[PDB]
Write a protein that binds this ligand. Structure first.
Ligand SMILES: *[C@@H]1O[C@H](CO)[C@@H](O[C@@H]2O[C@H](CO)[C@@H](O)[C@H](O)[C@H]2NC(C)=O)[C@H](O)[C@H]1NC(C)=O
Ligand code: NAG
Lengths: 208, 57
């Protein structure tokens, strides 16, 4: 049973704050077959090397993927305190991980382009009694609380969004703002890999 | 004219509806949202527009 990466290869990839997640157990992977379809621009890992990530056996392998501009590479890193890791996408700190930035070649026609790149630059709770703003930072392996009020594609750089909260939720506002980056000639994407070693069977192994 | 001005002006339109319907709590909640956004964007002209709105309402 081979791990099936094919969902990634069909459709317009979401923006980073709507990252799509594939979860693999009890299968055999060929990371080369997947990456050879793309022009890989950057392949960086934490707690493991790029050579080891494609050669070890895991209890699970998680692959997140999204449209993402290469020009924002420095914001997509385990070392970054910028708006991507604060409000959009944060990988586990306790498991080995990789981040791959790749370009979609013109002959990969089943991966289609959104009209632009978008990301959340602010997600905050407003507290009415104190008139204070509290940033809502994203948790590892979770979506921003603001994914409900930020559109799948931001219309104009700097747009603002809101939802009113009930007294049962603490009242006040949930507010957000979005940013845009112009689409590139070929689509650029980010891939986030998270692996675990298990006290159970390591049933996610490389295809021999 | 700009993302924050469009956002605030939409919020102030809802505030006028709340105040005309007698929902003073909702009016204040919306005014605070509008004031927060204008200050978040460092739009001092828009802050003055919200003041004139509050006076005129
Ligand atoms: C056509 O598709 C092939 C793959 O089938 C593309 O080849 C990859 O291109 C990138 C960038 O040049 C390389 O880093 C990969 O290693 C290539 N893969 C292989 C297996 O060689 C090719 O670029 C595509 N051509 C066009 C015109 O889009
Ligand atoms: C993995 O994929 C590469 C690239 O297509 C292929 O050449 C290689 O034979 C594969 N390895 C397997 C199936 O063990």
């Amino acid at each position: 049973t081979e791990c099936d990466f094919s969902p990634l290869l069909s459709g317009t990839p979401p923006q980073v704050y709507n990252f799509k997640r594939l979860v693999f157990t009890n299968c055999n992977y060929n990371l080369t077959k997947l990456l050879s379809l793309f022009s890989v621009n950057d392949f960086t890992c934490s707690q493991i090397s790029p050579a080891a990530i494609a050669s070890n056996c895991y209890s699970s392998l998680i692959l997140d993927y999204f449209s993402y501009p290469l020009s924002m590479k420095s914001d997509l890193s385990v070392s970054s305190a910028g708006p991507i890791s604060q409000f959009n996408y944060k990988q586990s700190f306790s498991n080995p991980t990789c981040l791959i930035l790749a370009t979609v070649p013109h002959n990969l026609t089943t991966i289609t382009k959104p009209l632009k790149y978008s990301y959340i630059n602010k997600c905050s709770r407003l507290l009415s009694d104190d008139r204070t703003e509290v940033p809502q930072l994203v948790n590892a392996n979770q979506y921003s609380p603001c994914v409900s009020i930020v559109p799948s594609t931001v219309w104009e750089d700097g747009d603002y969004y809101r939802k009113q909260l009930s007294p049962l939720e603490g009242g006040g506002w949930l507010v957000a703002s979005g940013s845009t980056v112009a689409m590139t000639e070929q689509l650029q994407m980010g891939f986030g890999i998270t692996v675990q070693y298990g006290t159970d069977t390591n049933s996610v192994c490389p295809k021999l | 004219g700009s993302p924050v001005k469009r956002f605030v002006r939409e919020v102030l339109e809802e505030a006028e509806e709340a105040y005309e319907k007698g929902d003073r709590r909702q009016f204040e909640e919306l005014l605070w949202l509008a004031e927060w956004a204008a200050r978040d964007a460092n739009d001092e002209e828009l802050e003055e527009e919200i003041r004139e709105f509050e006076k005129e309402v």
